Design a protein around this nucleic acid. Sequence first.
RNA 1: GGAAGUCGGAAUCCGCUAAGGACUGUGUAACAACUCACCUGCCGAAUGUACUAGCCCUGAAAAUGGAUGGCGCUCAAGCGU
RNA 2: ACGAGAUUCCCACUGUCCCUAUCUACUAUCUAGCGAAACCACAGCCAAGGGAACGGGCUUGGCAAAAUCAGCGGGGAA
RNA 3: GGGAUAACUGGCUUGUGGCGGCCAAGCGUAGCGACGUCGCUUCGGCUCUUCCUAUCAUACCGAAGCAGAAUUCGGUAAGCGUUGGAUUGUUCACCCACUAAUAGGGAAAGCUGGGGACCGUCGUGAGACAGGUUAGUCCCUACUGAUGAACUCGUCGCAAUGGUAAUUCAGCUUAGUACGAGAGGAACCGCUGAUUCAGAUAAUUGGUUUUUGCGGUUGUCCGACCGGGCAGUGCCGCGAAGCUACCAUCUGCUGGAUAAUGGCUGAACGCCUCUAAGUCAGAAUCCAUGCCAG
Lengths: 55, 135, 61, 356, 62
Amino acid sequence: TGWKDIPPVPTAQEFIDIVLSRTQRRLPTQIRPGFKISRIRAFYTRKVKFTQETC
Amino acid sequence: KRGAPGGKLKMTLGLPVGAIMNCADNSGARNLYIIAVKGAGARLNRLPAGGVGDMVMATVKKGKPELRKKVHPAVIVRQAKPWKRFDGVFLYFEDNAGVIVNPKGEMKGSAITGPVGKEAAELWPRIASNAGVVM
Amino acid sequence: AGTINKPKKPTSKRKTTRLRAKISKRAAEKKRKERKLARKNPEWRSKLKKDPGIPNLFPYK
Amino acid sequence: GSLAFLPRKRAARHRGRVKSFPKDDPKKPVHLTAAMGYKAGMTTIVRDLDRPGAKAHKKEVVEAVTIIDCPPMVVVGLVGYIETPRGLRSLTTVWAEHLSDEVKRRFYKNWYKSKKKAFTKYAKKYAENNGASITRELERIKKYCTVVRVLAHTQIRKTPLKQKKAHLMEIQINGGSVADKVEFGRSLFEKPVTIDTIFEKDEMIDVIAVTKGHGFVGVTARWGTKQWTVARAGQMGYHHRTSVNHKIYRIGKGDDEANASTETDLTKKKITPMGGFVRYGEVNNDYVMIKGSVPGVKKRIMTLRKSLFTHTSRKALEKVELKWIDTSSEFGHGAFQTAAEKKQFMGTLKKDLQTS
Amino acid sequence: AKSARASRIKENHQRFKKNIAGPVEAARLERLSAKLMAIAQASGVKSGKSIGRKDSSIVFPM
RNA sequence: GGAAGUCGGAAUCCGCUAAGGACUGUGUAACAACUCACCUGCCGAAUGUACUAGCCCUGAAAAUGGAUGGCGCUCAAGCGU
RNA sequence: ACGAGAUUCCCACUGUCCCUAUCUACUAUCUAGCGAAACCACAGCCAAGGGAACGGGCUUGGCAAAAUCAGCGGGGAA
RNA sequence: GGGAUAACUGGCUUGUGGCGGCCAAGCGUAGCGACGUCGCUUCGGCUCUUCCUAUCAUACCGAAGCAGAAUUCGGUAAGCGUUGGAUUGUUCACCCACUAAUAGGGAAAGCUGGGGACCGUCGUGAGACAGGUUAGUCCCUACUGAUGAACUCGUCGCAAUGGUAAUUCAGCUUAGUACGAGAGGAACCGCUGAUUCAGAUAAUUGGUUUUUGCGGUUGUCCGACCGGGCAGUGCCGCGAAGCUACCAUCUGCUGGAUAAUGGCUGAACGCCUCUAAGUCAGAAUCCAUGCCAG
């Protein structure tokens, strides 16, 4: 049929902005030092994992 | 284009998800198992339900082995739950039956056993072409 | 932004006394660290400073 | 549930107030706005649909309609309002001479034991050369008021109701100069106004009434469950409601003797069902056949008013053609429209021969 | 979809109210007013033409 | 393939000069054409650049409705002396 | 082969559910008579502030109108 | 065995790594030194009300070889919604679809499944003990409804204030048109339905039956018949009335001002500029009307 359905390929800088904005706005961004250590570990683990899946 | 018919009028739906209805065509299937209803809404705890002329997604429980390999669209042709037509007539059939139909609306079989509901015949011309009795 | 029609929660300027002591302790602590760091002073100090001199716009230069 | 109807308390009054009359401009002709009727019941009709673009176009459709008994209202007064920075204010009202006993019953709680002298001194105002006082009030309305309303009361002696205390309301006079409508209101004194003059066929109206009561009901049936925002138990029903966009399908005359007849069926019959409207009686006056359902129990006072805005749908300004009107009994699985049709079907009975 | 308070829907309704619904309701009002017209037509101090006085507060009592 | 300052690599000189880059962008398949740099005429008196110091905006905020103490205050009822 | 043993599958049934509705009796409700106990510093509206993440009485705002009946569960170191 | 210690965090947190060199305005008179570039790489489920926006969808805008269709990135926006199953084979636990979409959090919370510490004795290259002791703290108010004294009783009204409501999709026409080599393939105006939500209503259809209304029938009894009693309404059939059901039917409405953004005239700044003075339009936004209470 054709190859018009290929999604656009972002530039190197636009790729980073797309990935980093998604992990900032699609996930909560408020953690406090007074929480449990397991809760803090789970919060930052989610951010690292979420960034990779989008990538 | 999702196979939700347009111009359909409101009627009493009497075939929820998880119901067994007979198969009215000569494609080799005997009964169908409803697992999804095309055009269903999004409300909590509500089981999607179908009616005469509504495309559903069904699997063949008993029938020809080929038809038991994949989930097929189907249009409900007869309904045991009484419903009302706009002429003020409350009517019902003695069984629940449908026909295997491709996503566009073309019947896979070539003949229909039993009468075809008026709403299903008017909505889908292909079912109207392969019908012997319309009531 | 639609701030006029639908303003958000105000940012309180009512100082809580917990912050004020906490804000004063940090000012005291920060001042002490400057004095201690200026004591270590691994940096050269001269006698004569760079005098900018008479300004050019002074009519009697 | 909905927080727009939140104070789910009993209505302060059994009658129901209009709360809004349509906006007035002097360019339109002089006309009335609202009227009163009594709910009779429901019946089934067959309509020859003429809806271009619908599936039932050029086809017959069966619909449910409600019947409201509408005896003519009597205009017995006039009220004038002025605009203030604090809203609308009643400046003065001018009553007519010779009020009826029913409208005087509204003014009394114990009418039987009372010495009926309401408006006795007011009547002397007309007939004892104090007509200057009456005219002075009429001229006061003309030169100071911006909205003029008419006090009209029902005639329940014509209604098959045990109640003898009539219902008063103010109906706004719209479409004209303040001077023009004042002469309009004075000319309407002591005169009956029929429903076919206020409304007409195939027009869409709003109905105001108090809903059926249910008493103390829990959360399951009150708020519809599967603080002020949390569902609680309390009063369900008897709530003031304003339902809009209800199409008048027919206005019967009562004296026609063929109210339920159409141009399709040639049966001389009235609107009253075989055996009478269940729990209401017989409609012997003008009636308004309103499509669908309407708030209120049978024999409840019903407030009909006009649409506040010009309509934006083809449901309005579309002709309504009727094929057949049901008249069979509502007291059971009726199958006969007339007493003659039952006797023809079953032949003659044992009692028929014994009496004859 | 477009809301009931959409600007475009209001503009379309305004044209409908002016070009289709208006004339029909104007003709209806003429007929109704004619019927009610038919039913209805079926010294200043001593006469009341000089509108005089019949029969909490706003100012401070002096 | 075509490449004329302007798809690319590298050099980037001289003449006429008042001045004009072996060219700053638009443009052509390549030209053409336009534009910038720079120069002249008209106009006429003050301008440009970069920093410094004040005050003001931004310089990141979640989740019951609320806080310079409150009303409120703008040549202040704010800021400096 | 046996087992009120467990699990899976197949047929059948079901207000378990889509999604609730109706009906009956005793209560709940009101009256006559009889008639306690638990518990009780004194009280009892909300918001922000009250350094010791502590408020119910203070601050300063929102406010704020007698006397009652029924429903409820929101509040009272290692 | 002894000593210091109840324990932590509170304008905390969020999107862009560290180390070394080069460059580097300054500070300074060698040392600190940003942005760039180079080098090396206890847990799960259940929930109702409200709030937030860090917006998945619906509305409106800016940009992209964006022809059309379908999209992608970004902006204003929380008005309105954000599903039904599997969890029965393997694992970083995640497939099946339906849908316009199946966004993330706070109030931090309760139910439900999964998954103790001191002495004593006998020994210690090491544990054993059914040896002893022990902690395990129906009223007021809030809300929802109903009455109410005082103002003579009543009738007809006003409207401060409080709440507020609608939502999404599809089909016909435009049109096999614009657009396109072909394959394919829109939109505004107009018309008709359906989903979710909300408020009502009983003509019709279905459900319900102490109408104990009529009939049939089992056991026992009134001596048989007739007519009946009892079986806490014996059982069965129909059953009006009432109540109810997106299991039935009806209805859901219009002005102004704005955000992003696109403009007009025009200084700042002898060009220019949507902005400075002035001003036009413009979102499901805001405020009101319609609606509910008084």
